[PDB]
Amino acid sequence: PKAVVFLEPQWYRVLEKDSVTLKCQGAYSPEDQSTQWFHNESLISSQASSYFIDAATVDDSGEYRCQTQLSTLSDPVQLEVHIGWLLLQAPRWVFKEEDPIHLRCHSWKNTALHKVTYLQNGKGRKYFHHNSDFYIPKATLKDSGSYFCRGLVGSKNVSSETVQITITQ
């Protein structure tokens, strides 16, 4: 009878100032449960079914667990709050052949970003005049590798940390 934490939106990697809702799912019963929340194995004040982070800061990173009256303590869910201009967000790291790959060059505060490139293994893979999501419709083995994004915000040339994407046979 384990509780489960869900993230909405689902990205476990976020930038400072992003909103993040952690949702606690307890037993699937009409029997109203109360909720409790643990962050880095410490109790926090909220007893709400949804724990809402308005404007994330680095200290909001770490492990979250929740529990309801009719539930055992959840497995941990990890939240990583990054500091910087850009974060390349993926819904997962491992894809199989012919799966769609959808990547998002998330900017700090959703600030407008121009002349955006998604690089694969240090070579330009896709360029867009304005910020736009990267889409491979059918993944192939050659799409695996190290990915980051970069672009212009105002006059600043900025870039995201690298992520590893794998395509399996």
């Binding site: 407008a112 121009h114 002349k115 490139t117 070579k123 330009g124 893979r125 896709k126 360029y127 867009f128 005049h129 304005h130 212009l152």
Partner: protein, 219 residues
């Protein structure tokens, strides 16, 4: 109140328009060119159209190069317009107009030669100081002064053959509104003391025949 540049200008191809090399506009054996370079052309909207104008009148003899795939996954497209030396030198304006689907309106760049009364440069070669003779390499100095506009070419030779080991300063604005510069040619001390006549060649629009050449030689 004036209209402002929109943010749509910020994400679209960019255009850079380059003047001809000054040596090319001055010498008969050369063909001066105006170069319009378009960068940040997407793969999604790759077609680039050029129109060229010389004082507002369209010309059709520009040569557009095939697009080049850049390492960053953009295209770069170049169009080159060959120019008449005299057209350039008489201050005619060159307009490159660039059209592309990612742009709401075409981008226009215009270039022409710097305006103002041309002034003839004075060219003077100076031998190395006696003090530098203790050194293994000596400095041969070419002072060029009183030229306007700043567009100029300066070269070095000995026995008809070009010398490679020289450096020329940027043009510097002088008090009288003219420019001056200095070119330093480094030569082996032995090559100087041998009697080789070294030459400083200076090419500027206001010189007779666009060319002057002063010599430098030992005692």
């Amino acid at each position: 109140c004036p209209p402002c540049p929109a943010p749509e200008l910020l994400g679209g191809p960019s255009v850079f328009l380059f003047p001809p090399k000054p040596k090319d506009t001055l010498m008969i054996s050369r063909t001066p060119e105006v170069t319009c370079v378009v960068v940040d052309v997407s793969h999604e909207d790759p077609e680039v159209k050029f129109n060229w104008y010389v004082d507002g009148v369209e010309v059709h003899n520009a040569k557009t190069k095939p697009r080049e795939e850049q390492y960053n996954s953009t295209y770069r497209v170049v169009s080159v317009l060959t120019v008449l030396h005299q057209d350039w030198l008489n201050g005619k304006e060159y307009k490159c107009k660039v059209s592309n689907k990612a742009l709401p309106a075409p981008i226009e760049k215009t270039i022409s030669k710097a305006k103002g009364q041309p002034r003839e440069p004075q060219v003077y070669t100076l031998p190395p100081s006696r003090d530098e003779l203790t050194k293994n390499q000596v400095s041969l100095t070419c002072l060029v002064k009183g030229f306007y506009p700043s567009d100029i070419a300066v070269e070095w030779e000995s026995n008809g053959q070009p010398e490679n080991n020289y450096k020329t300063t940027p043009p510097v604005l002088d008090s009288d509104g003219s420019f001056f510069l200095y070119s330093k040619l480094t030569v082996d001390k032995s090559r100087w003391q041998q009697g080789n006549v070294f030459s400083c060649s200076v090419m500027h629009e206001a010189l007779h025949n666009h060319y002057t050449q002063k010599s430098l030689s030992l005692s």
